[PDB]
Assembly symmetry: D2
Homo-oligomer: 315 residues x 4
């Protein structure tokens, strides 16, 4: 057995050889993950979003390694007074999958880490949080399911760890997660069918046709939590979709707090992530809360999606 | 705080005043649930079906209160040698939601309890396990999610309990679960669209139309675990569907191990459960492994389903 | 692995064949033990006496199997209104070893169970709690140490169980605890030397002489918690002593809440328990809070003690 | 609530400002402590010495921060191949209190940390492990009792932390532990009376005299585990003694693995630690396994001991 902490030490070349700093960063994360886990595992015994947001924020600050944060909850960025010397910033979705807490369904936490652009010693600015996804130095998520797992990447593969309540530590369970060769599952909220772009509606029809030669019809799976659907699709192959519609002309997902970190993780696992036309990671952020259409998973599935959008324009 | 054990004592009138026996029955269940939980919570750190099956079987026998069992795993019934004096039989689905274990997604355990028809002192026979669902004296399930919960009924409401790892006990969290007045979520594997009965395909179209006056289009949610989708729908309202198709002419779900206990639970919560035409609980079992189409959840939703099947016959 | 609950079922002949009632009795105990354990295991993260007293009292009442209780904390007995139909009474020392909580040292819980003398339907009276120790139908203790263990007897041996946090259940670890053939450890508060009876002072000198032929000098061990010193001595052999002195002319230990249950346990393990002259279990209680000199452990050691008291009278 | 990890960060001035290295050091310790804790908490469900030794050894090496270790178990020192670049060495007593495991009594782990004398890049030698106790840069212990606690010092006070199973983290419970003004408890194995030095026998008599003006007679407490007796005495005041005798002419305790770290901790808490004549920390080690008489606790008590040895020479 090998712990997350030991693993970080062992992989000295990752994270630009700044091992000591990665350790501090993930230490903040796992602590926050442990705290949230405790409250969720006894939720039965909206409000949790705030709790998660507060605990993760306090933890990151206590490591004295982050200059400031950006939360899906927060309207403005949060500058850590006394941390001006820090050279890292973190964007996060404290509790992804709000509609699942009360129903004992999987929810998660997403984080994205960037190296600041503004001079050390100075307070960070939105400039530091509006960099394209391709500049992230680290990304990962925490899934709170039957078991609690932490998944992350620095650019050298995707590593997953499972929390062991018996020990109180995160243990390595898979060092190199990769999407299998082919996917046979699509994850989308099909109730929103009539409002999806014509290309997406076509892909859905594509997915339901009878073609044993290509594993069709695919299976449908949609938990309602980006983190949990992604995690399953990554292990078993599949694609997750959340296109634009009436309620969300530019999609529902946040480009910086959700799309970018998951996109970085998908790409590092040999998958693909796009807004249906361009690479998520190369999009230049316009605003902190910018939303974006999102399609991620096995490379061939996302491609089929882009093709259908191409051949059937106009939503 | 009140424990499951204390609650059982307090409700002396339920279970036909045989309090001492209910206690023993649920004691077997929660122990099995605790054992399985432990292995699942560290699954990361098919095979689990066997483990769950063995642990639940051994636990029920050790209470010396059950004459024998029937498992979705077992081909034949299991007679407990030395328990001929027992007057209860139990049918179970040890681990519902096989495809979810490896992906850290919710799975569950389902149990159904019947009073034997054959004379005590004698070994039980299939006759004891082929009684209609309306004869069950108890039914419930265990959901292994972010938290582990046990839900059951004896005919006087549906009671849910949440396991507290800190204490090592199940605690009452909701004494009277009821479906809310209206449902706005449907749970079905839409990838199997083309093979569903025409009436079901119509209902799906119904679900996706724009009619704010009736909360349409509904939201789509499908975890892939009967226990977890049911649980969510029960708390938030909704309907779960698994009709017949090519791969399963009579549906996929087992009538005795899955449909009946969930049907008993749905009805006790003010909901409805049918095979699309008749009441699940009144169906006279033909065989131990009989499968059946299944539609369960809010009463009005299941009715809409029955109506569409009525107006559009032939699958 | 076998649980406490399963073990009770398996031993149908013990407790006068009233299996169902023993189960309810120990269920109250283990629940109280689990609750206390939780608060103690995070004590760092006098007051606990009250907490323990309240939790055990509430638990016993909730099983609707006990007519009333007597606590070392309580001045008067506690009659359970609505439990007049109960035929059992319980005397207890909720938290034995007060001076150990703040120092992270072992403490315990002691319980004694009697069958009432007064007619059912009527409220219990001190008469029910003043019966000699030889009438107990059950006795045991819970030790909260590196691990939490429950030890008890009904008259057919001493059984010990260890709590498994991973499972949340008590598991059988030893079905027949017996003192080894010989003891080589004495447990007494030697700082109180000058005030001990002359016979006890002689025994202490005896214990420190050089006589390899009899394993002397013995080893000295004194944790400060009756439960923990007893438990160790029972497994490794030894004797525990708490004689009379200035601060306590009749000893410090309570005859009914401490001496009797431990005496019943010691005798069932092949050991001996006396006040230095007579058998603890045959003493006829004079008052609820009666104190008594107490010497318990390996039979030969207690005998040596009685002999020295005999040969050197006057304290 | 503040974690051990956060506390270390917050106290940047301690440990010679080498914060990052202290963090790695204690991370190895707490992990080993968590692993051992798990096996001990289910011991019921000699051998543990080896387990503890192996787990702590593997953990320290995995942090790639220690050049090598010295264990009370090991005959020779253990050089970490591939860690020649490390500048720290650690001496340890993996499982102090062997005779307590089987009896569910408190046991502990002791560690001592030194900065090497030999050039980096080179393999460490006994020279690095034979430095006087006054050169330690860190010392502490882990007590496995009703709760699991970690206590340590770098020269700026004694800090204690309690492990929270609910969270899986160590939390600060006391930042500045100090012996109270006066002690009233002595901890010694009195069964070995006749073989103790005359001065010690006199002190024991001193301890048992009647002198309310000085809190005499003192109370006697002796758990049999150096870690647990020390911990209690530190919180409540008291003195622990283990002098020389026949079985151990130079005492039983190891000078480097036991006496030095506890001596450093006692002094940092305002207490005193000596071999009955000189300061433990200033003794120049002669051999790796050198034993030494040891007296530690409240300053005035140890002084009384030194005085009696002075006035009554010859053991
Ligand atoms: O309820 P809907 O419209 O399917 O949206 C669910 C999605 O929204 C989120 O909760 C927010 O990102 C995701 O976790 C999830 O994929
Ligand atoms: O993979 P499919 O065809 O959607 O079937 C999933 C269903 O099968 C089961 O796993 C077996 O009953 C259910 O738990 C679940 O609802
Ligand atoms: O502090 P003293 O006088 O040794 O008394 C300790 C004894 O008192 C009790 O705390 C009360 O029974 C026992 O648990 C323990 O054996
Ligand atoms: O059994 P004895 O001779 O009292 O020795 C016990 C002492 O030995 C050790 O086990 C070894 O250091 C200490 O933990 C304890 O104080």
């Amino acid at each position: 057995m090998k712990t997350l902490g030991e693993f970080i030490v062992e992989k000295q070349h990752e994270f630009s050889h700044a091992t000591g700093e990665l350790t501090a960063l993930l230490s903040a994360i796992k602590l926050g993950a442990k705290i949230i886990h405790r409250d969720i595992n006894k939720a039965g015994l909206q409000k949790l979003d705030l709790f998660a947001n507060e605990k993760l924020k306090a933890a990151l600050k206590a490591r004295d390694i982050v200059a400031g944060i950006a939360s899906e909850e927060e309207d403005e960025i949060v500058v850590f007074e006394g941390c001006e010397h820090a050279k890292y910033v973190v964007l996060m979705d404290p509790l992804d999958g709000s509609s699942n807490i009360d129903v004992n369904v999987s929810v998660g936490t997403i984080f994205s880490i960037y190296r600041r652009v503004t001079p050390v010693g100075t307070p960070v600015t939105e400039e530091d949080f509006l960099q394209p996804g391709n500049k992230q130095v680290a990304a990962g998520y925490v899934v709170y399911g039957s078991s609690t797992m932490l998944v992350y990447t620095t650019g050298c593969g995707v590593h997953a760890f499972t929390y062991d309540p018996s020990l109180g530590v995160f243990c390595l369970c898979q060092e190199r997660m990769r999407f299998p060769e082919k996917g046979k599952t699509y994850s989308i909220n099909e109730g929103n069918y009539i409002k999806f772009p014509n290309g997406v509606k076509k892909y859905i029809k594509f997915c339901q046709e009878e073609d044993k030669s290509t594993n069709r019809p695919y299976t449908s799976r949609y938990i309602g939590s980006l983190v949990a659907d992604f995690h399953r699709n990554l292990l078993k192959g599949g694609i997750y979709l959340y296109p634009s519609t009436a309620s969300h002309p530019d999609g529902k997902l946040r480009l910086l707090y959700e799309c970018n970190p998951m996109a970085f993780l998908a790409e590092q696992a040999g998958g693909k992530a796009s807004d249906g036309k361009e690479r998520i990671l190369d999009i230049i952020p316009e605003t902190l809360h910018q939303r974006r259409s999102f399609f991620v998973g096995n490379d061939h599935m996302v491609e089929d999606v882009e093709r259908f959008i191409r051949e059937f324009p106009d939503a």
